Design a protein around this ligand. Sequence first.
Ligand SMILES: [Mg+2]
Lengths: 349, 116, 201, 238
Amino acid sequence: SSAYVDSHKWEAREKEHYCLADLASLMDKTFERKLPVSSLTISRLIDNISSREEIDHAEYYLYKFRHSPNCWYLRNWTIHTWIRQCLKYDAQDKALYTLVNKVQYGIFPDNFTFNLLMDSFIKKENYKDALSVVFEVMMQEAFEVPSTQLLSLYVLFHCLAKKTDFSWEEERNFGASLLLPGLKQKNSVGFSSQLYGYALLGKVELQQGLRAVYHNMPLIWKPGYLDRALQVMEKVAASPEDIKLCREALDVLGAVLKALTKLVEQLDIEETEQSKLPQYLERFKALHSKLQALKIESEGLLSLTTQLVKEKLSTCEAEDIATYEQNLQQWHLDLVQLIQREQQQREQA
Amino acid sequence: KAYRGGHLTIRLALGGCTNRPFYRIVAAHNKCPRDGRFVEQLGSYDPLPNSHGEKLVALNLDRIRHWIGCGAHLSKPMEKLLGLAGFFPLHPMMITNAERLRRKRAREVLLASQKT
Amino acid sequence: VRPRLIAELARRVRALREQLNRPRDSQLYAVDYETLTRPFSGRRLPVRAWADVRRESRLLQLLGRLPLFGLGRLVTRKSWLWQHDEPCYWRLTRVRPDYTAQNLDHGKAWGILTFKGKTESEAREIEHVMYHDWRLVPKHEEEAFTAFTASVPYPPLLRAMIIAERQKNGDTSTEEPMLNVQRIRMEPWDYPAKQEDKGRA
Amino acid sequence: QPPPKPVIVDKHRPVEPERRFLSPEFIPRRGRTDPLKFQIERKDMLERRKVLHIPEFYVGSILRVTTADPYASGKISQFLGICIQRSGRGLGATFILRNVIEGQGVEICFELYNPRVQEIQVVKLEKRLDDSLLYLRDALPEYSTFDVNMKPVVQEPNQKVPVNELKVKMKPKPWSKRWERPNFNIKGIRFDLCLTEQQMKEAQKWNQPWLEFDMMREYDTSKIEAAIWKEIEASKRS
Ligand SMILES: [Mg+2]
């Protein structure tokens, strides 16, 4: 989707044409007198940047703005000015660095901007960068967007192309990321990916407890993830169509390997998950048998099904472009008034 | 001496020579000393028994209600004495102490019956 | 009468100086996790919060991982939800982090709150922001989580007092006296307080 | 997380490049003698310069010096002070420093080529309109009192010499040198308060305008300093 990716309006719309050195010296003076500064200066700077060391200056001054008296404003149009200025001048190492330590820089792209970023990632054909980036988007929890199809494709292709047997951080990241893209209640792919994510989350819990489930991850504290997976399976069997994949075999493997032979957050009356493993496994066998008695092809590769998602992808990209141009119009609306605001100070002077 | 902040408090003042305590429920400030000045003497209490064996205590109900309606915090020991009197609810710590003593006495009787 | 000026001089000078160069909120909230002592104070922490400060992080440390510190995003009072099965949260309205903080892990933020589904129409101030007992609820399972649905006799001596009084008045009034308990809204301990009313070093 | 690193680039073209500056002690004095002396002592101090840096400075600049002293804490002596003057030529060229501490005004005369000194540092690099700052004695102590552990004020790598245009108040009239006379041609001080119209009208009597109009006493330096640059460049190449 070259038309969906590229955009000449953003590149040839509202350029300031001020001196980069002048803006740098101004920002240096303002942040040496440690008084607050508007985002208009940073926006003009970013629009004026045309160089690598200039984007480096921009990264340093963005760190300074994060550590400046004002941090909450978080103007997404300035964020996307910076994103374009970085990605067109090809600093993916620095883009990824900022995106991973967002707490250090605080970049937060929206649906269309991030979809453009991930389309550039597709064009360059890299996997690990996109993987870390989709983990950071899982941290963001922003999936109710037209980029949900892109996120689903990414996760469902990378979990298959991973071929990594042992990594607890990575496995928890996958198990937590496989939920939010599928929450839009789409089809078999959707709720079965939700099922597999529930399975991975229960596995991570049973293997390293419930602490990391919520400590450095936004998630719910109900330990019965296996129970929730069983609930999903039984409600699906009760209810449409269920195109299935052999990841139920991975679920079987996890369940069997867990059935195989300090603070206590668990409640005394309710028994512990270690003691619940048995009935978990009996119910899992029972629901396996129910599903096979009820869809059961388990041959259609999920990554191949994501090209049929290209239909709704190409359908929703239009509304995404519409939202992006609406955002551009809103930005041109508010920014011209913000310029008159800066002129108010000179009128007073 | 005008104490900053603070609040009126009816509490126990100590009197009498050593080995003969005599308490006096009296209205005073929170920052007030033990036997420092007061505003109005309300009542008195003898923690020792008389010839009859009973112990002495006096309460000025009208003035106490006056001071409460005017606003004043109270001390746990005298509020416990009030709850024992009946003008005031009984003390939860009193209930707990009674229950502890009764459990301990039952335990002692059990140990005696075991030894015998 | 002889006046004195240096008193007010030093008073207002100290006022200006301390209000200018007061210790930063992040600076004085910082904690070293192996010794469990706040710098600039040399005080130890309570045994009940030792483990929570060792393990769990702070509110702004949680909010630094998402845009705008999650306006409307669900953070629940860990203490309230451990003390009661009902859901309790904070309708965070305004936020302001501390610029001097390195990780932007401290600041002030508040809005409307709710306790056992008792939502208040007042965007008032939070309490105990700096504690390590903050829990973020995602944007899923959130509606399911937030889903939620006489009198006593007087004391014996006092009722006897009133009996004697009304008997002297002349009426029989066999009815037993009572008071309002449904009016008296006994509030639990964990009801929040006024951050601005409580001071600061 | 690692910390970011600062970067600053301001590139107004005809400001950044400065080219030339010679040391005030390389050039010889008007006196007559064979230049062999000059060149031999010069190459001596230059193959010493290959070790020691002498960070360039001016009068009124603040220098922090560390030296190896026999009798001192750690056998080292560290002293900060403002540049009053640079006197002498050749190896014996020295510079004067001064500082007010504990209410006492102390000053040092440093040899900038003695091996006893370990190294030099420029805390600040500036220039006073006056070539000689000896009147800082009679000046107020608040002008000379400087901090010892103040960090070096960062200076650009290639920029012009900052010249502070200021003037200084002074102790009352009972001075030792009579700075008010026009023989010294000094401007940092303020007649308007240090004296009256009568005193300045009486002191300008000794004024002799013809000194600067004379042209047989002046010392040309162009070809001399040219040879100086030439031979220092030769020593650097070799
Ligand atoms: Mg003399």
